[PDB]
């Protein structure tokens, strides 16, 4: 009833490196007090929190999304460039804060270079214009003599930033968004912005706004599916119950398959190979204010491990994903003036991203399954999932072919699971198992106790067949050879 079979010689498909993306919005203390804090003793002279930097570098961010989120739909990017003391203070409608614009495009790009991430910029389609977006693109990517390319040089960067990922609006369907649009308006607008941005720089990838309204999605695909590269999906989940939280990995799975099928049903989109960008996702159900400082526990970190494992298996369909968000706001990392906490959501990335290959290999998993009905998100919406596995895994190998990584999530709350594992043609060797778990499903890290939830390692002896006991509510990578 439980077992795992891996064939390292059978490569199924690449795993897109962008599944491990992140997102920082100008919301609460995400940016100001989070990644950035002028005159914190913990910041360098650019204002970057150095302790945050060290934690972000450790999870090897492939791409970073900015600046929103709801914020970008009332953000004018030119307010954020040039001599800092000359930048206007603006009232942000989305989260109802004064915004000083001291963190703006050039500082965001500097932050990306620092951490090694590809910038992923979202444009303003609420109060912004086509010209305004093309100017932002020209500023970042232009290598000619246009005014905004010159302006980037004048402000201290001769070389183009080459921003590759551009988000065509944020959540333009929602009544909460400034300048929100109907399906027809947004679909025509997404086609218009995308096609002209691509006339200026044909190398960019454009992410168009998707949601759960299947008519919305289809209008977007029908109208813009000849020029866009992704349609985005946002997924937020969770409740006080353990199984109700972690099972929604498998709800997310069905949601994604649905969006994929929509793409399949629009010839031009199916033919260009439009894909999905899961560009916002996390647990989010406890907090509902303008700071969103959700206190993640181990339960939430197991959900996060389950998503990363899922994306390794589905990255051909969903090559771009971005946890919402990096710091403080729905934060993987929580900061205080005098330190930081690494939540179990952070730990999920610290585990998977440091123990994972570039190619997915044939993995066949035997598992008991369960059915569940629960609630999710801040409004406690009911959902159900059928046949969610208690045990799930994905095996990957490194580019060179020297290392095998078997990630295993044991969702069982109540019991450890002894699992026979088979690996075809594997010698008999030593391997390290890295395990994320904690003392109970509501365990948390604090300033006082920063490692209640942490990754432990043990050496084990491995063969073509072997068994391993996986603790309850845990995720482990068996790193071999």
**Catalytic annotation, residues:** 171, 280
Single residue of 44, 46, 88, 457 touching its own copies by CB under 8 A: 88
Single residue of 39, 45, 83, 91 touching its own copies by CB under 8 A: 91
Q: Which does 200 bind (CB under 5 to 8 A by kind): its own copies, ligand AHR, none?
A: its own copies
- Using CB under 8 A as the binding rule, whether residue 150 contacts its own copies is answered as yes
Nearer to ligand AHR (CB atom), residue 44 or residue 254: 254
- Using CB under 8 A as the binding rule, whether residue 420 contacts its own copies is answered as no
Chain centroid to CA 173 = 21
Single residue of 45, 85, 98, 467 touching its own copies by CB under 8 A: 98
Binding segment for its own copies among 144-152, 299-307, 334-342, 458-466 (CB under 8 A)? 144-152
- Using CB under 8 A as the binding rule, whether residue 147 contacts its own copies is answered as yes
Find the shortest distance in angstroms from Cβ 241 to ligand AHR.
Answer: 16
**DSSP H/E element including 365:** strand 359-366
- Using CB under 8 A as the binding rule, whether residue 416 contacts its own copies is answered as no
Single residue of 65, 198, 234, 334 touching ligand AHR by CB under 6 A: 234
Nearer to ligand AHR (CB atom), residue 155 or residue 377: 377
Binding segment for ligand AHR among 181-189, 253-261, 269-277, 442-450 (CB under 6 A)? 253-261
Name, in order, each residue with C-beta under 8 angstroms of 430's C-beta and a sequence gap of 6 or more. Answer: 459, 460, 461, 462
From the CA atom positions of the chain, what is the Rg in Å?
A: 22
- Using CB under 8 A as the binding rule, whether residue 236 contacts its own copies is answered as no
- Using CB under 6 A as the binding rule, whether residue 20 contacts ligand AHR is answered as no
Residues 346-385 that bind ligand AHR (CB under 6 A): 350-351, 354, 358, 376-377, 379, 381
Both tokens of 246, joined, read 């972690």
Classify 148 as helix, strand or coil. Answer: helix
- Using CB under 6 A as the binding rule, whether residue 345 contacts ligand AHR is answered as no
Nearer to ligand AHR (CB atom), residue 86 or residue 459: 459
Classify 239 as helix, strand or coil. Answer: coil
Q: Where are the alpha helices (DSSP H) in 265-314?
A: 267-272, 298-314
Q: Where are the alpha helices (DSSP H) in 142-182?
A: 147-154
Nearer to its own copies (CB atom), residue 212 or residue 240: 212
Total number of residues binding its own copies (CB under 8 A)?
A: 37
Binding segment for its own copies among 257-265, 302-310, 367-375, 429-437 (CB under 8 A)? 257-265
DSSP state, residue 285: -
Distance CA 438, CA 453 (A): 5
Q: Where are the alpha helices (DSSP H) in 2-45?
A: none
Distance CA 235, CA 252 (A): 7
Distance CA 421, CA 212 (A): 38
Find the shortest distance in angstroms from Cβ 49 to its own copies.
Answer: 24
- Using CB under 6 A as the binding rule, whether residue 211 contacts ligand AHR is answered as yes
Starting at the edge strand found earlier in the chain, the sheet holding 391-397 runs 454-462, 429-437, 474-480, 404-410, 391-397, 359-366, 3-14, 417-423, 465-470
Classify 65 as helix, strand or coil. Answer: strand
Q: Which does 78 bind (CB under 5 to 8 A by kind): ligand AHR, its own copies, none?
A: none
Name, in order, each residue with C-beta under 8 angstroms of 336's C-beta and a sequence gap of 6 or more. Answer: 447
Classify 224 as helix, strand or coil. Answer: helix
Distance CA 303, CA 348 (A): 9
Residues 150-189 that bind ligand AHR (CB under 6 A): 170-171, 174
Distance CA 305, CA 349 (A): 7
The CB-side HSE value for 90 (13 A sphere, CA atoms) comes to: 21
Distance CA 325, CA 27 (A): 10
Nearer to ligand AHR (CB atom), residue 127 or residue 457: 457
**Shortest CA distance to 180 belongs to which of 234, 216, 222?**
216
Distance CA 429, CA 463 (A): 6
Residues 57-116 that bind ligand AHR (CB under 6 A): 58, 68-70
Nearer to its own copies (CB atom), residue 13 or residue 46: 13
Residues 112-141 that bind its own copies (CB under 8 A): 127, 129-131, 134, 138
Taking residue 447's Cβ as centre, other Cβ atoms within 10 Å add up to 11
Binding site for its own copies (CB under 8 A): 88-91, 93, 96, 98, 127, 129-131, 134, 138, 142, 144-147, 150, 178-179, 192, 196, 199-200, 212, 214-215, 218, 254, 257-258, 261-262, 264-266
Binding site for ligand AHR (CB under 6 A): 14, 16-17, 25, 58, 68-70, 170-171, 174, 211, 234-236, 254, 257, 260, 280, 314, 317, 324-325, 330, 350-351, 354, 358, 376-377, 379, 381, 434, 455, 457
């Amino acid at each position: 009833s439980y077992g795992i079979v891996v064939d390292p010689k059978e490569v199924v498909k690449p795993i897109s490196r962008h599944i491990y993306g992140h997102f920082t919005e100008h919301l609460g203390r995400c940016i100001y007090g989070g990644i950035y804090e002028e005159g914190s003793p913990l910041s360098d002279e650019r204002g970057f929190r150095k302790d945050v930097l060290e934690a972000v570098k450790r999870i090897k961010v492939p791409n970073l999304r900015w600046p929103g989120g709801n914020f970008v739909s009332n953000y004018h990017w030119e307010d954020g460039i040039g001599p800092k003391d000359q930048r206007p203070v603006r009232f942000d409608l989305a989260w109802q804060q004064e915004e000083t614009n001291r963190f703006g495009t050039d500082e965001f790009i500097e932050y990306c270079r620092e951490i090694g991430a590809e910038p992923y910029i979202s444009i303003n389609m609420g109060t912004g214009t086509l010209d305004e977006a093309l100017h932002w693109l020209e500023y970042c990517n232009g290598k000619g003599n246009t005014y905004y390319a010159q302006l980037r040089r004048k402000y201290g960067h001769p070389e183009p930033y080459n921003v590759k990922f551009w988000g065509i609006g944020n959540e333009m369907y929602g009544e909460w968004q400034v300048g929100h649009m109907t399906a027809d308006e947004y679909a025509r607008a997404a086609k218009e912005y995308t096609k002209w941005m691509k006339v200026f720089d044909p190398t960019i990838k454009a992410i168009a706004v998707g949601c759960d309204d299947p008519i919305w999605n289809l209008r977007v695909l029908q109208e813009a599916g000849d020029v866009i590269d992704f349609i985005s999906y946002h997924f937020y989940t969770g409740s006080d119950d353990y199984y109700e939280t972690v099972s929604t990995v498998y709800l997310l799975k069905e949601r994604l398959i649905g969006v994929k099928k929509l793409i399949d049903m629009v010839d031009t989109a199916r033919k260009r190979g439009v894909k999905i960008a899961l560009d916002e996702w996390n647990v989010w159900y406890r907090v509902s204010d303008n700071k969103l400082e959700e206190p993640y526990d181990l339960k939430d970190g197991i959900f996060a491990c389950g998503v990363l494992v899922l994306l390794q298996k589905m990255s051909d369909i969903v090559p771009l994903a971005n946890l919402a968000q990096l710091v403080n706001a729905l934060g993987a990392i929580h900061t205080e003036k005098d330190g930081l906490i690494l939540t179990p959501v952070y730990k999920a990335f610290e585990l998977i991203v440091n123990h994972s290959g570039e190619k997915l290999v044939k993995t066949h998993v035997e598992s008991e399954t369960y059915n569940i009905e629960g609630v999710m998100f801040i409004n406690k919406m009911p959902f159900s999932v059928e046949n969610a596995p208690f045990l799930d895994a994905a095996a990957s190998i490194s580019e060179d072919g020297k290392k095998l990584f078997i990630a295993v999530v044991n969702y069982r709350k109540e019991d450890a699971l002894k699992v026979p594992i088979r690996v075809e043609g594997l010698g008999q060797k030593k391997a390290t198992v890295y395990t994320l778990t904690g003392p109970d499903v509501n365990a948390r890290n604090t300033m006082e106790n920063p490692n209640v939830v942490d990754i432990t390692s043990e050496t084990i002896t491995v063969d073509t067949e072997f068994e391993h006991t996986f603790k309850p509510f845990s995720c482990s990578v068996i790193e071999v050879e």
